[PDB]
Amino acid sequence: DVRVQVLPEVRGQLGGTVELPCHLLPPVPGLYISLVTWQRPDAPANHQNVAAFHPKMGPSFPSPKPGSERLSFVSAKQSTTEAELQDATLALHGLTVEDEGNYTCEFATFPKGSVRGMTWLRVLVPR
């Protein structure tokens, strides 16, 4: 019923800001998004969870790489009023060669369960 819409590959220049789109579709009434988590499946155990968003608490960045300084949630908003976690688009400011890789966006929902989508980040090199 519920699915994750993500781009298969996202290309971005070195140093520039890029967007990793993640959307939970279609909007189902009665379905509650308990958590949103961005993960790097290639990175080690202590560097898996790069970004997370809670409907009440808001955003958090557990991994120090890329960290809070280079990451941000584009449209995700917390409740103060109801929360909107449907749009899990992540922004990557100051792109480096280490950021090139796989990014899995996961939605912890009730009662449908867990739904995820994966995107490859292609860091373009100049000269």
């Binding site: 308990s34 958590l35 988590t37 993960q39 202590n46 997370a52 958090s60 912890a108 009662p111 867990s114």
Partner: protein, 103 residues
């Protein structure tokens, strides 16, 4: 950051009952949701606010509890396989534990 402890590689007899338990230690992260899953099958969900939810496919063979654990009732030889406890937490992220059951 933190770690998940399991009941380990459990062994059971046909027709009986067994307990699948997981515990997240070495972190104070707010446990928003606990998912009891298999490779490509969802058994049960435990939400901190919305409560428990059991899949219709396991509604007559699974009991919720103890705590954030699962109770498998009337065990069949088909119940053999890997079981996963996925902990959705804030701010740490997503923790995963694996349990192998043999009937």
């Amino acid at each position: 950051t933190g770690t998940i402890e399991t009941t380990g590689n459990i062994s059971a007899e046909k027709g009986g009952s067994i307990i699948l338990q997981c515990h997240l230690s070495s972190t104070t992260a707010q446990v928003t949701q606990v998912n009891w899953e298999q490779q490509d099958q969802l058994l049960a969900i435990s939400n901190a606010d919305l409560g428990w939810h059991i899949s219709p496919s396991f509604k007559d063979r699974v009991a919720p509890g103890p705590g954030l654990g699962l109770t498998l009732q009337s065990l069949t030889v088909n119940d053999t396989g890997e079981y996963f406890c996925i902990y959705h937490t804030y701010p740490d992220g997503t923790y995963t534990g694996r349990i192998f059951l043999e009937v």
